[PDB]
Design a protein around this ligand. Structure first.
Ligand SMILES: [Zn+2]
Ligand SMILES: [Zn+2]
Lengths: 178, 13, 178, 13
């Protein structure tokens, strides 16, 4: 798979849109790159709901077209958080295929192949340094077909090297939505 | 304080 | 070795300069403190080239005296990205001369002792919280002579505090230039 | 796209 980044705001608009809570912009793509006053990470739409990680969003609202949107979900122990998908918001469809051949699409549009080492981890065939991953938590983990199989939670580091990663299984997002 | 703003996107292909 | 931070811009300056992509101000000092919309970090000149970390800059251009400078070097796998150094920049000279006594310089200007513990490894003497090195990615690691041994990539931290540092070693920057 | 932007400097001594 392949993907590309597309900036939609600068500091002055993040700011203004952070205080008025209302985002008057057309949402597009499936994974958005979001920001707060002290952080930027990713958020992806699976099953009509914008999921992100708790250590990023926390419990804040998501600026939206009619005003701020309130969290639909909040699994602090699972590090998961979600908002109902505002108008449009292309949504990746859950997995199906159980392919150990995962795909981590980083915050800079970089796609890196990951081998599912199980229920909630995936080894990197090409062990990049841990910092490469900064600002990419919340991003999706696909399988050759373009299906969502998780949300990047954290890189399992060792001596500063990101040998593998930890993702919330899409099955766990589903359990939540139940 | 404030809300989380979508700052850009990543189009998949 | 010592350092003193100097601010040269503010919000308007970054916002407009980042739009026009043309920075009329003049470069000065070995390590400049750069910034994008979502994040702020550092950049250090070594051998007449502005080196920085890929996670923070991505593939953006630098605002320059004659417009936006395109990235000359880009070594993604080592989280490195370098721009051709703009005028007024007092570039550092490489080193890596067996010394194991390094000094990390942060973005508020604090020179802290890092005992080299490998090629891209270096334990601290004085542990600090992960919170104390935010925005210092891309900073330089100085041996006692004042010559650059590498670019700081991220803290090597253990559930709470930062214990070691992972750095892209100067040597690797030299090989990337060829 | 938006550009990185030098916002200040750290002067070694
Ligand atoms: Zn599938
Ligand atoms: Zn030296």
């Amino acid at each position: 798979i392949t993907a590309y980044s597309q900036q939609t705001r600068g500091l002055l608009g993040c700011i203004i849109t952070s205080l008025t809570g209302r985002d008057k912009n057309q949402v597009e793509g499936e994974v958005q790159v979001v920001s707060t006053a002290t952080q930027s990470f990713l958020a992806t739409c699976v099953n009509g709901v914008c999921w992100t990680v708790y250590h990023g969003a926390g419990s804040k609202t998501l600026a939206g077209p009619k005003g701020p949107i309130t969290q639909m979900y909040t699994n602090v122990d699972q590090d998961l958080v979600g908002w109902q998908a505002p108008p449009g918001a292309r949504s990746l469809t859950p997995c199906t295929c159980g392919s150990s051949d995962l795909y981590l699409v980083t915050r800079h549009a970089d796609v890196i192949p990951v081998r599912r080492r199980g229920d909630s981890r995936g080894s990197l065939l090409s062990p990049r340094p841990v910092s490469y991953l900064k600002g990419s938590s919340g991003g999706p983990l696909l399988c050759p077909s373009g299906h969502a199989v998780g949300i990047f939670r954290a890189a399992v580091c060792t001596r500063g090297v990101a040998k593998a990663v930890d993702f919330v299984p899409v099955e766990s997002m589903e359990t939540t939505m139940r | 304080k404030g809300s989380v703003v979508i700052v850009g996107r990543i189009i998949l292909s």
